[PDB]
Every structure is written in C-alpha cells, then in structure tokens.
Design a protein around this nucleic acid. Structure first.
Ligand code: ZN
Ligand code: ZN
Lengths: 182, 153, 607, 126, 132
DNA sequence: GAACGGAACGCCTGCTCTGAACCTGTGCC
DNA sequence: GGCACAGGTTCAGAGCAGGCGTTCCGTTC
C-alpha cells in the first residue's frame, strides 16, 4: 500500500503508462487495494483514453467492492467525469448502484456516501442538470428506484438554481401516475 | 428528564418553604402527581375551609404548565362544578401566561389569590360571577355553606 | 424591481432629452442599502432575505458573457449591488458572517465551470476587513485545499492570497497546505503541478521578509528544494518559477543567495563557459524530441528574463559577491560569442528550412524564438550597464541584427504557410519599463555625449518600429486581461507611470514630425512610425477608461481642470485630421483619418 | 503545557467582548518561562477568584427552565444579556422554549427571542 | 468450509475470483482461533498446489496455534516447491513459528530452500541461518 | 326585466431578442 | 488563383407578453 503511495516519487517519465496497464492488471486481481491504486493512477502521468477504460473496469466490478471504499471510488468517477461522459456514467452509475444491497457500519458509511455525493452534486451543476435529465428520461418505466426519489429531495435540499426544474419534473412525473405509496 | 430536575427542587422546596396558607407533597395514593392544600383565603367566604387540589405535572414540563383542579368542591366564578380553573398561567402563550420563570408554588399562590379575588371577566359559572358581583352576600353565604359541607372536616 | 431600477438609470444618462424632464427618483439601489444600515437597531428577521437577495443577484447576472451597454452594464450593476449587500450584512451582522463566507466559497471553489472574479473580489473585501472570522470557518478552508488540484490556476492563486493570514496564526492548516501542494506536484492533471508552484511561490513570497525566523528561513529552503524537482518538471511549470521568484525576492530579500544558486545551476546545464566556442549556449538540450512530439522545456529566453531582473535588483537594492561579478562576465561572454554566431552556429536558414511538420523544423523554429528573446534580454543588458557608451550600443545594433535576421527569416517562413503562426507574436520579453526609458532615450535625448551612440539605433529605423511594436503588444495585453506581460506586471501604478511616459514620446514624435514627410514607399507607409505612435495612443486612452477610472486626472497632469487639458489635446488630433483631409483627395490615408477619429471619440467620453 | 493553550469564553455576550478583545491584544505577551496562570493574569490583566464555591453554595446556577445542572453532559452556559436577570439556561432547554412560542423569530441556525424570566432580547446560536 | 473449501480448490480452473473469498474467509476476525485450527485440519488434508498455499499463508499470517503434530506435517508437506507463493509461505512460517522450528524441521527447511529458482533466497536462508 | 355579449385575472406558449459560430462572398497581392 | 476579413445567416436558447378558460357584469330589446 505504501509502495503504491510512493510510486509517483519513484518512477521516471518513460515508464508511467507501462505501470498503468499492470496496475489495472492488479486491480481485477485484488479488490482490497482498489483505493490506493486509484489515488496512484490519478497522481501518475497517463493518457485519458486508458483512464476511461479503467473507469469502466471500476464500474463493472462495483457490486464486488466493500462499502467503506465506495466514497473515494465515486469521488474518482465524478472527477474523471467530463461534461460529455455525464449521462453515460450517470445512467450506468444510476443502474448499477443498489443501496438495497448494503444492509450498523453499513448505515454509517451509506450516510457518509450520501455526504460525499451531496458534495459532488452540490459542487458541479454539470451533474445536477444532467442527473435530472437522466431521471426525467426515466418517466418511461414505472420501475425507477428509491435512489431517484432520495436523490431528487437531495438536489432540491442542496441545489438552488434548479428548484423550479425539480418541482416541474416531479409534478410532470407524479401526475403521470408515477411516484406513489409503494 | 427535565420533569425530574424541576420536581426535585419543587417537592423539596414545598416541604421546606411552601407559600402562606399552602402546602404541596408527593401524593400517598399517587407517588407521581402532587397533592396541595390551600386553606381558605382570609376575609373570603372560604374562611375555615381546607381546599385539596391535584397538580398534574405534564411530561414536557417545564415547557407546559401544571394541570390543577379543586378536588374539594368550590362555589366560585372562575371554578365550575368539576373543579376546572380559569387561570392564565394554567395555559401557554398567547392564551395563557405559563413560562419557566414560574413554578408550582408561584401558581398555587396565584390560586389562593384567585380564591380570595374571583375574576368576574373569566366566568366559568355565570350564575356565581353575577351573584359574586350583584348579590355579594348570597355568593359569600353559598360559598361559606360550601366551605362548611365540603372544605370542613 | 432591481433590474428595472438599472434600466431606468442607464437610459436617462445616455440622452440629454429625458434628464430635463424627469426629476431623479430614488433608485432601489440606494433604498435597500439604507435597509441593511437600519437592521443595526437589529431587525434580524430582515437579514436572511438580504443575504438571499445579494447572492441571487450574483448568481443570475455573473459575467458568463465574459468567461456593449444593454446586455453587459445592467448585469454588471446587479451583482455590484449583490457585492455591496453582502459586504454590508457581513460588516454589520457579526452572528451571520459565518454562513455568508461559508456560502461565498461554496460558489468560488468547485464551480469554475462558470467564472467567479466578482465572487473572488467579494471574498477579498470580506476577509480584508475582518480575517478573524476565517478562524471559526477553517472547516471549509481545509476541504478547499481538497479540490486545490482540480480548481484552475486563478481560483487557487487568489483564494489562497486571501486565506494565508490564517497560516501565519494557525499551523495545523499550514501542515495541511504544503502537504496538499506537494501531493499535487506529483499529479496527472497539468493544473495541479502549477497549483503546487503557486502555493509554494506564495508561501516563499509572504511567509517571511527575513513565529521564529529560523522556522521560516529553513521552511522556505525546505519547499525550495522540493521546487528543484519543479525546476526539473515540464516547461510551463518551470516558466511560473522564473516569473514568481522575482516577487519572492522582493517580499523575501535574504533568500537571494540560495535562490541565485538554485537558478545559476539551471543556467550552466545550457551555458558552455569557454571563450572561442561560438554558440555560447546549448539550445538543442532545451528541446525534448520523443515519438515526433518535439517540445521546448526549460525556456531559456524566459530564464534570462528572471536572471536579468534578479540581477539589476541585486545591483540596486540588496548591496546597500562572487556569483554576480562572475555573471557580469557570463553575460559579457554570451554577448561577445553570440554577436559572432552566424546561423551556422545553431543550424539555421540553409542547414534548416524551418519546415513546420518535420521534427527538425519544430526544433529549429523553437530555437529561433529562444535566440530572438535571449538577444532581447542582452540588448537590455548592453543598454543597462553603460550611460550611452558607443561600443555597447554597437553591441545592441549587432544583437538586434541577430534578432531581426531570425525575425524576417520566420516572416519569410510564415509568408508561405497560413497565419496560424501566432508563435512569432509570442511576447517580446523587454520590460515595459525599459521600453519606456528606452523610447525616451531614443526619441527624447539631445545630450551631445549620448547622441553618437543613439545615431546608431536612429539610422536603424526597424529598431524604432520594434520598440514601438512592443509598446503596442504590452498595452494590448492590458486590454485583453487585467495585467501586462513582463516585469511590474500586476502593480498598476508602475504600469500607469510607464503609460504616461509612453504618451509623452508617442505624441512628441506624432506632432514634431507629421506623416507627409515619409520617403519610404507603400510597404513602409502601411507601418510609418507616426501611425504606430497614433495607434499606441489609441489603445491607452481606451484601456485607461476601463480600469484607471479614478486617476484620469493624473494621466493628463503628466502632459487648469480636466476640460482645458483634454481640449488642448483634442486640438492636436483635430488640426491633424483637418491637415490630413484638406491637402490631398487622390489616395487619402483612410486608416490615419479612421483612428484620428477613434481618438477624437475617446477624448469626447471625458468632456 | 507552559506554552499558549487554545482558550475561549462562556457567559453574557457584553462581558465576553472586552476579554476576547484584550486576549487578542496581549496573546504575544504570553511567555513559556512563567506558568499558565502567571501568563493568563498578565495577558487578560485579571485575577481569578479562589472558589466562590463555598460563599455561593446555592445562587441557583441551574438552568432555570429544567432547574438542573448536568443535563446530558451540557452545562448552564447560555445566559441573558441583562444585568437584572443574568439567568443561565441549556442549549436543549432554551431551543425547546424559543421554538415553541409564537413571538420567536429565527434567522438561519439562530433563534432570537425573549428571555423567559425578564422578557428581553436573547440570542441562541445552535 | 468442511464442505466447500475442498471442491472450490478440487475444482480445476480455480482463478483469482474464487481464491479472494476463501482469502476473506480466513481473514475475518469472526474466523476465531479454534475455527482457524479446524480450517487447518481441512487446508492440510487437501492436495497442496499454489491455490492451497496463498490462502494458507493468510491463515498462518495470524499466528494460528499448532499442536506440533500438525506443524511438523505442515513442515513435512511444505518440505515436499519452485514457487514464489511457496517462498513467501515458508518465510512467513519461519518468522511466526521460529518458535515451533525444531532442529529436524530446520533440516527440512534447508532441504526445502535447496532450490535456486527460489526468489528472495537470501532472506529465506538468512531467516533459516538465524534459527541455527 | 332579462337575455346576450363583453371585461377580469391566473396559466400556458409562441414570438422575439440575443448572442455565438460557421460559412460563403469577395477584396487584394 | 489563393487566403482571410466581413458580414450574412443560422441555430441554441432565455425571457417576455398576450390570448385563452372560467367567471362576473354592462347593455339592448
Ligand atoms: Zn436545562
Ligand atoms: Zn433574562
């Protein structure tokens, strides 16, 4: 873990990308060491294409990850997020995330995850706008989930410029015979 | 919790320094609620009467006032046939005047004050509030006969 | 209600017509301010809405137009209120100013999708009045350093100028800071390296002049050793150290000796200190070629800039010993050996054909620019030492014969290819200051002792138009952005003095000598030195009216109230336009006339 | 330990102001050769009383809402900005009082209201 | 673990995916000493391959208690070999159960380190020689 | 006097205004 | 003939203003 953390001071410039590939090799090979790898990759010097690849290679195994590590994971996803990779990751993110699955330590880090997501979405309108535009585009299915509700309440609680837009979207959603008791 | 910390000073303070003509002890029937005795105000028809009151302490007390009734029957403008008291410091703001600057003693003093001085502008009994005002002696006769059958011994 | 307020205002100034008729009725600007004032008697229902409003205004009409009058000015004036509203709820309400400054940085930080210069200048005046607040609100400042690798250069560069008053007092936060700047130095994102430089350059600047002095003189030498990694790091991140270390020197004098050796080592990696080796400098080791990506890193022209400035600074202010008396001989040797470096020295003109796809062309093109800017740093030095000594002004002529040959060569190369080569229009590094003092010496010196040396540069007409052109380049930089290129960059007062000195000579040559006396033909009629004097004059008067809004009085004092001075100056362009037009009709100078007008215009907004 | 500690003030906001202000003036006149007390007496320019405990054995320094000291770790800290009341309270008690009443008016995470005993403006910052 | 460990490992094409949970099995606090001992009676009864060792190093990483009866067999079994996994396994045994190393077991370790494919041999023999 | 056709205020949308970029005409060497 | 300024044009998109829907009241036979 410490060697990982110290790799940026150690390695010369010819041998960044090399290490990159074989760290993605280590990533699939061990879960426990997801965090420092990620931190490392983000404190390396690399090509952004590769970083897209590994970020998907996060996302596919994200059910397998113990909750403690998720925040800094999802912080990484939302600093690797572009303006253009918004709905892509968010739709995928919005799908793969569960929050039924996780549940006394579980509840505390769920809360701390939400703190971290609050700070993400609090902190770039990029996400808020597109996040919503990704929940309204889920007016189709009667089956949109606990996260979508709790997340709406959140963006109304935090983000201010959007209040009318949340209320508009919630009213055009709720009349439609979507969100109900269940 | 707060109920305990008030009641602790109050039970102790009503055993050690209760107001004049007044006592309050933790009831021997009811070891949660308080029994008071207010002895009939001087130069009122309640002279020679010992008036028992039950003081119900609410749960969020001292954020709510005490809940007091005359258990001895009392012939009075601001007290009805079931012992209900017309008192401002028995209700919360703005209708009432309870707040934490007060305590069970200050109100039981205000009760002996109301026994001596009925208010005719908060009548529970219009017959007695009118009689009190327009035939004082008939009120004072009836309240003194009241004091001889119900507040006597 | 508020915006209407401003539409009412703007309209009513513009015309004479409406002012007559309407008696100036209270604007909701002044009314709400009085509301804030009279919450002091402490109506504290009021204040939440006032904070709320001031922010909303700063939200809605931020400059996103800038990332006319009608879409720009009544939408400056909404937040400039916002700013005053929140400035006064902070300076009056002591209870609040925790949530106020919380919510300010809430918006300054993680944003930088929409700009926030107005928020930064709010934040600035908040903390400057009473920084003492900031010590209850450190929580946010600790999690601002969190994202101080993903925020760009200007958020961070300023956010921290504000904060640092904290880190003289608090210390746990300073062991959070250098920790964050260090962990950013070893980043992916290119901004994070430069965030590191900027936090470090400013920790070195205002974190002591020279707690205990010994726990600062060591702590500056600690971080400065971690900067010799950055002196190794990529071009841009180096560049920022050449430029920021001059202010570190001004604000922290005693680190001079250490910093000199930090640099002078970095010189010698490319300086070959033997007489009779004809390229005195190693230009081809400034150039990294890998997988046909051919980058300049360690910009040497810019290194000589920092060198040459720290040099004059040490001659003048520190002294009232061996490295600087060596560096005299270093620059004299780079002088004398570069004079006689015949393009054969650096494989140029014939051995290179600056072919801009090829690796070799990219290398040769990078080096011609390096050479050119180094020639400039040394033209400065030859001029600097001597009070107009005929040898060193002949040195200057030959250094410029170097510069100009490389310049007219890349002009011949860009006369074939498309005009996307804005790399030749990359800044001439001469300090605006020298330009000033220079052009004064060029056009405003009649002393017989100097005159033989100046008759060199004056027979040299291109050196004249070179100097001017740099005057134009610099003033333009000020127009675009809120600061100039060279030294004395962000210190407005200096800039203003130079502009005054500028005006003096620009007008002086514009007047004494007209445009009609020229003997040069059409190619030199398209850039006659008169005309460029007048255009320079143009950009000033304009830019003055952006920033230097108070001092416009002083600008004229240079050269009886505002109106007689302005009138006498108007007369000169007015008589020039008369004399321009009346004389010829055949082929009248359209552009000369055009900006005689653009001038008579600018003077007019004053009167 | 002899070095400057983090220290701060509880009580009536008119009494705390000059003390904080004089601490800010005189915090550079701290010296770690003296004791903590021999530096605080010359920093804040005061003496400390020797156990006003035994003379003020019942001054009722209780909440005067709930009439207890030690409600769940909390101390009587919130006081009245008044010479004639000076009545301490708790965070929980004063909040459940000033939120319950009509008259009480809240800015963000502050409640302005009337002191229960004397009906003067009192401020509570959660 | 009496049921499942064997087959996961007595399956062919057992990969990282399979091992990582038997890794977590042994590493849980909940897997009490007594149970790490019972895990031992099971890990040791299996045919030893690379997949057995990696999990077993992480069980033995706790300092799981040993009757010398089983330790010797672990050492016998250990001593029957070219592998990086096995190198580190042997190394970690000899630091924690130095305490359990007899003269005869140290001979077994002298035998087991004979290889020159052994990486970190200097380490292993330095640890071995340090017991002598 | 009473039956018909116009006046009144909360909601939704189409029209307008703007500003930003790209592109196609045309001006000069 | 080739390239770059100029101005036309074209589109995103913000914001404004008026006509409708549900309801009351003046006017004319
Ligand atoms: Zn209390
Ligand atoms: Zn009070």
């Amino acid at each position: 873990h410490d060697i990982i953390t110290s790799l940026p001071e150690i390695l010369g410039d010819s041998q960044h990308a090399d290490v990159g590939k074989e760290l993605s090799d280590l990533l699939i090979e061990n879960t426990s060491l997801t965090v420092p790898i990620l931190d490392v990759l983000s404190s390396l010097r690399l090509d952004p294409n590769f970083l897209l690849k590994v970020r998907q290679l996060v996302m596919d195994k994200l059910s397998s990850i113990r909750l403690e590590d998720l925040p800094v994971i999802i912080k990484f996803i939302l600093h690797s997020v572009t303006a253009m990779d918004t709905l892509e990751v968010i739709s995928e993110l919005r799908e793969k995330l569960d929050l039924q699955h996780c549940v006394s330590s579980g509840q505390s880090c769920i809360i701390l995850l939400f703190d971290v997501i609050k700070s993400a979405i609090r902190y770039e309108k990029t996400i808020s706008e597109a996040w919503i535009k990704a929940i309204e585009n889920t007016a189709s299915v009667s089956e949109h989930k606990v996260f979508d509700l709790v997340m709406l309440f959140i963006i109304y609680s935090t983000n201010t410029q959007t209040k009318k837009y949340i209320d508009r979207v919630l009213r055009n959603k709720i009349r439609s015979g979507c969100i109900q008791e269940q | 919790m707060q109920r305990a910390s008030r009641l602790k000073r109050e039970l102790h303070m009503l055993a050690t320094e209760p107001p004049p003509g007044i006592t309050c002890w933790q009831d021997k029937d009811q070891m949660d609620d308080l029994r008071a005795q207010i002895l009939g105000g001087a130069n009122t028809p309640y002279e020679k009467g010992v008036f028992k009151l039950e003081v119900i302490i609410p749960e969020r007390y001292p954020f709510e006032p005490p809940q007091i009734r005359f258990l001895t029957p009392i012939y009075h403008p601001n007290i009805d046939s079931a012992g209900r008291i017309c008192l401002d410091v028995l209700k919360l703001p703005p209708k009432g005047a309870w707040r934490p600057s007060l305590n069970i003693a200050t109100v039981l003093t205000s009760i002996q004050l109301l026994m001596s001085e009925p208010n005719p502008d908060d009548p529970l009994m219009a017959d007695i509030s009118s009689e009190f005002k327009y035939n004082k002696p008939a009120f004072l006769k009836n309240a003194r006969q009241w004091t001889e059958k119900h507040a006597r011994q | 209600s508020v915006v209407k307020s401003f539409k009412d205002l703007q309209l009513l100034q513009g015309s004479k017509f409406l002012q007559n008729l309407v008696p100036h009725r209270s604007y909701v600007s002044t009314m709400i301010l009085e509301v804030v004032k009279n919450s002091v008697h402490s109506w504290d229902h009021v204040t939440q809405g006032l904070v709320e409003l001031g922010f909303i205004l700063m939200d809605s009409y931020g400059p996103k137009k800038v990332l006319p009058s009608l879409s720009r000015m009544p939408n400056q004036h909404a937040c400039k209120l916002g700013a005053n509203i929140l400035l006064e709820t902070f300076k009056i309400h002591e209870m609040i100013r925790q949530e106020i400054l919380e919510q300010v940085l809430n918006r300054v930080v993680t944003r930088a999708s929409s700009p926030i210069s107005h928020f930064l200048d709010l934040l600035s005046n908040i903390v400057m009045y009473a920084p003492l607040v900031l010590q209850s609100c450190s929580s946010k400042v600790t999690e601002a350093f969190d994202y101080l690798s993903f925020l760009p250069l200007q958020t961070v560069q300023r956010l921290l100028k504000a904060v640092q008053p904290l880190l003289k007092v608090s210390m746990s936060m300073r062991d959070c800071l250098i920790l964050v700047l260090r962990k950013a130095m070893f980043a992916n994102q290119l901004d994070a390296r430069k965030s590191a430089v900027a936090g470090f350059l400013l920790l070195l600047k205002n974190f002591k002049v020279l707690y205990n002095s010994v726990a600062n003189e060591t702590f500056c030498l600690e971080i400065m050793d971690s900067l010799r990694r950055c002196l190794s790091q990529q071009a841009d991140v180096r560049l920022m150290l050449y430029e920021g270390f001059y202010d570190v020197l001004r604000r922290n004098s005693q680190l001079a000796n250490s910093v000199m050796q930090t640099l002078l080592s970095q010189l010698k990696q490319f300086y070959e200190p033997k007489p009779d080796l004809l390229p005195p400098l190693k230009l081809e080791a400034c150039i990294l070629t890998q997988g046909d990506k051919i980058s300049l890193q360690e910009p040497l022209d810019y290194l000589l800039c920092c060198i040459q400035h720290c040099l004059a600074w040490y001659k003048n202010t520190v002294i009232p010993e061996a490295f600087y008396e060596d560096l005299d001989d270093i620059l004299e040797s780079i002088t004398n050996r570069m004079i006689k470096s015949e393009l054969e020295d650096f494989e140029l003109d014939k051995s290179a054909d600056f072919s801009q796809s090829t690796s070799i062309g990219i290398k040769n093109n990078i080096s011609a620019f390096l050479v050119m800017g180094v020639c400039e740093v040394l033209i400065e030095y030859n001029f600097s030492i001597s009070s107009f000594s005929k040898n060193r002004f002949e040195d200057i002529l030959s250094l410029f014969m170097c510069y100009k040959k490389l310049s007219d060569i890349l002009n011949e190369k860009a006369g074939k290819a498309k005009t996307k080569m804005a790399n030749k229009t990359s800044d001439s590094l001469l300090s605006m200051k020298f330009v000033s003092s220079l052009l004064t010496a060029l056009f405003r010196d009649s002393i017989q002792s100097h005159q033989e040396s100046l008759s060199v540069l004056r027979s040299s007409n291109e050196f004249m138009r070179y100097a001017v052109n740099v005057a134009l380049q610099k003033v333009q930089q000020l127009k675009e952005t809120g600061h100039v290129s060279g030294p004395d960059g962000q210190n407005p007062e200096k800039i203003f003095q130079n502009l005054c000195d500028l005006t003096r000579v620009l007008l002086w040559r514009y007047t004494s000598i007209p445009t009609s006396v020229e003997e040069s033909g059409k190619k030199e009629k398209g850039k006659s030195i008169s005309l460029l004097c007048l255009e320079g004059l143009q950009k000033i008067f304009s830019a003055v009216q952006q920033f230097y809004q108070p001092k416009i009085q002083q600008f004229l004092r240079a050269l009886v109230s505002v109106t007689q001075r302005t009138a006498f100056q108007i007369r000169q362009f007015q008589r020039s336009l008369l004399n321009l037009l009346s004389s010829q009709e055949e082929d009248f100078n359209s552009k000369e006339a055009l900006l005689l007008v653009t001038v008579l215009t600018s003077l007019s907004k004053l009167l | 330990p002899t070095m400057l500690p983090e220290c701060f003030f509880l009580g009536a906001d008119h009494v705390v102001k000059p003390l904080g202000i004089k601490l800010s003036r005189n915090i550079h006149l701290w010296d770690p050769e003296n004791s903590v007390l021999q530096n605080l007496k010359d920093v804040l320019e005061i003496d400390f009383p020797a156990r006003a405990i035994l003379e003020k054995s019942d001054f009722t320094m209780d909440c005067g809402i709930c009439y207890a000291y030690q409600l769940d770790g909390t101390i009587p800290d919130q006081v009245c900005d008044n010479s004639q009341c000076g009545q301490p309270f708790h965070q929980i008690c004063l909040y459940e009082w000033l939120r319950g009443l009509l008259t009480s008016r809240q800015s963000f995470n502050i409640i302005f209201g009337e002191c229960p005993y004397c009906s003067k403006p009192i401020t509570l910052k959660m | 673990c009496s049921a499942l460990l064997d087959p996961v490992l007595q399956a062919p094409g057992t990969g990282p995916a399979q091992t990582e949970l038997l890794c977590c099995l042994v590493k849980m606090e909940s897997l009490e000493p007594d149970a790490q001992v019972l895990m031992l009676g099971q890990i040791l009864e299996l045919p030893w391959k690379e997949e057995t060792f990696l999990v077993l190093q992480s069980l033995l990483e706790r300092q799981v208690e040993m009757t010398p009866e089983k330790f010797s067999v672990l050492m016998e079994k250990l001593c029957k070999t070219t592998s990086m996994a096995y190198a580190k396994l042997m190394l970690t045994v000899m630091t924690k159960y130095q305490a359990n190393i007899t003269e005869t077991q140290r001979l077994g370790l002298a035998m087991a380190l004979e290889p020159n494919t052994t990486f970190l041999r200097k380490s292993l023999k330095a640890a071995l020689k340090h017991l002598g």
